[PDB]
């Protein structure tokens, strides 16, 4: 029941870089109205790694008040520390999320065995909530082989893998060895290709502004309309080329600010403001998506 | 007119590691009988880099003898040396190949300017044959950015790009920037996803023993039967998994030996022999391929 | 006055993973007794990335209580978040440290200007304490160029650079460009070579158990006796060889526990316990070091 | 008796990019005039990968005729092909070279076992000449582990390792493991540091225009005077910085030309020409070295 298209939720801040609750509530609602299947919260996109544990739990609490019952909720409780991750797993459960997820612990190198214990511990603290193993080499620096992936996803309590890797040979080997595994395509720019290789859904940050297109790509491939799938993917890719140039999170928040969802589109330091020169393309995009 | 599905041709040898002329003609014939659209000869797969210019020009000659007019023919002409590359390019036209191709020169680091001159010089010597730039970062060590690729494929005389890269975001970006460029998918393992991304054909080493499967995928995608395409790609990938374990070239030659095509399944040193323990799966692979 | 050999301090925990203050004090005193020039506290070795801010500030406080005025004290105040880093810099000034330091913010990619602004802000908060830029590509994933290093190293308030990089061409290039820069060699396994290249001194994990050997390498090069300098480096590398196999932090802690300096040799999860098979060698190492 | 400083020999060419025999001999004798212990010929620096086998053999001969006797002579005989490597090996014996050498075969990926059989075959064809294994990750793309290096250098017939790696911890581990092994430092910019870590000699391209400085470093460390070893390496690096900016092989030949050793400082295609804006620096350098 976790298969699907889930937006990786952004965290709106106020001018003082404090949580902007009203914009967070707006953002959750905006996503629901968009037809999203669920939300992945407290992930990279939520700026979790520049947030405190209490701040991350406050967010989980607010979106559950806002979305529990309406759409699927996955809480990324991942920290480098197993104990901090367990604390967040207990809050996700306490607030009613449908699953937890954790990036592979980073900075310090850990063995495959250390990664398994880390996941086992979080799973135990999740008290029943399935675990979403999260592989994202580019940001974490943890290069996971297919064999290591097999070990992690076969752990008791692991019901899914968020694959943020562009290796689509591995995407299909994973699907072939694990037929029942929920597999989330992680890179928005290769979504269509990801689904064809074996992913059965996706989690992405750009879904916050055009989640309807990814759902569109999914319907297309289902209705055997490769052509429409391709057109949707390239329109997504033109937006991603832009976001990548502007700063992905700040870029997304800016489009959202112009759509009246977010009050102040600031990311937390050390992230800087969006380059003034980008605002016109961003303003235009906002206009274009609203219509 | 050169867009399509082209097998990267293997160079058969005898026990003394010398070109086995008779097996070569048999292999070329076998490829044609599978309904392949053309042959990419003298590339990585034809063991070009452990062959002299004269043995390379000799294979060009024989294959052209065997298939000029029957199917399209692309001659890979690259060498680290610009002058040796030019020399093979003249043989290509001289033997009537439809196009010429050249891997980005490797080992020594070269600038973008130096790489362009390398292709211009070769283009000059190909005397009218369109050039197929060849990007294969994993083996050449040359990682081309989107812009370096832009600069190279827009070189006068360049009519295509062989993209042996698993980055399908780059694949669609290239397509979106060069809508008229011929785009061959380099990694067989991701063929279906590659076409979906924007590639309009493919060149691959495994097409030698199951090229029809890739044709079946082209057709299935055109016909909107995504299901069969995936099925086909899965079946191709089960085979590729095996070949990567056994060693790809020697594994393909061994299979072609069980199909009668090749007499002696040897690659040239430093390539070592296939593992005796592998031969049952390879023999059985051949058997079922006789489907 | 910041030039010298400083031990990268470990953080002793109890069986319940909480700070072991009595062992922390012993370790500080142990290092002072070894004739160490100072301590670098709250860095990677202190397991700072699996500690909360409050915990990190508590360690800063206890170490100053034990060592202020006795040896130099540098506070690694860095976090990905600029704000958290500022909070730690203020605690460092509050407790009387001689300097502050911060690793290049990681996980999320940041531009050079974003990095400069992070350091400036932290420098502001340190209220007078100079800054030691910390470059450690292997763990952070940020491989600075000599150019970026120059920009960071020239920021107002930056008094030194901790170079945990094995590229000794860059070390001498940095020394050539900044003849007045305190340059700490960060990879213990190449200390002698690093010093020869231009390193001014060093900061390291292994200094906790054999800091006198590093002091010996300094003196030997100062006396042109490259013969004993290599002897010393060789002994250090046989130990580093073992530590890398056992897990560095836990191996150091195990040796320190066997030397009755710390009560419990555990690291926080996800680091796992030392493999029982390694204990015989760690016990013997501890024995010989004590002599 | 192979230990020592050996210049990696450039191969002068004429305007037609053909071998400039008179300039070759002039360079050979010029290295002798400097006081080199031997010359490493037919390697990266000799532009061997952009030369035919016969051209390579021809160079081996001219150099031998000019030097079999006055200095030590090592013949880089490596090709991707083992057979081509064996051919050059036989020629190495024929002109009476002191030792043979071969880069790990590149481009295609090969197993340790294949690399092993490749070296055995060449050793064999070297007819008793000792083999120098050549590890140069950055150009070959072959990253050797300590364990792989161990297997290779303990192959019967192997007498040395040319280590073109900036990993000085690996350098020291190699020395500790094979104290009888001749270990050549491959990167000129870290010569001082490299010998300190355990290399007993060195092979470099910049030795051609300043072999004496390297010889001076070796003596300076023997006489236990790190002071002038550093100052010497600093000078070598100020120069190396320039050769990197200008293009190394072309930058060295150009200096040699202003020193009246080589007729035309041209490298073969795809190497481009030296930027006209650099000539003042290169002349001024050619001027200062002359003393």
UniProtKB/Swiss-Prot annotation, chains A, B, C, D:
Changing residue 134 to A: Loss of Neu5Ac cleavage activity. Is still able to form a Schiff base with the substrate. Induction: Negatively regulated by the transcriptional repressor NanR. Induced by N-acetylneuraminate, via inactivation of NanR. Homotetramer. GO terms for molecular function: identical protein binding; N-acetylneuraminate lyase activity. It catalyses: aceneuramate = aldehydo-N-acetyl-D-mannosamine + pyruvate. Belongs to the DapA family. NanA subfamily. It holds the Pfam family DHDPS. Inhibited by reduction with NaBH(4), and by Cu(2+) ions, p-chloromercuribenzoate and N-bromosuccinimide. Inhibited by beta-hydroxypyruvate. Co(2+), Mn(2+) and Ni(2+) stimulate activity, perhaps by enhancing the opening of the substrate Neu5Ac. The active site is at 134 (proton donor), 162 (schiff-base intermediate with substrate). It comes from Escherichia coli (strain K12). Aceneuramate binds at residues 44-45, 164, 186, 188-189, 205. Optimum temperature is 80 degrees Celsius. GO terms for cellular component: cytosol. It is found in: Cytoplasm. Pathway: Amino-sugar metabolism; N-acetylneuraminate degradation; D-fructose 6-phosphate from N-acetylneuraminate: step 1/5. It is an enzyme of class 4 (lyase). Optimum pH is 6.5-7.0. Changing residue 44 to T: No significant change in kinetic parameters for the cleavage of Neu5Ac. SUPFAM superfamilies: Aldolase. The record marks 44, 107 as: Required to correctly position the proton donor. Pyruvate binds at residues 44-45. Changing residue 134 to F: Retains very low Neu5Ac cleavage activity. Its EC number is 4.1.3.3. Changing residue 44 to C: 40-fold decrease in catalytic efficiency for the cleavage of Neu5Ac. Aldehydo-N-acetyl-D-mannosamine binds at residues 164, 186, 188-189, 205. This is N-acetylneuraminate lyase. Changing residue 164 to A: 4-fold decrease in catalytic efficiency for the cleavage of Neu5Ac.
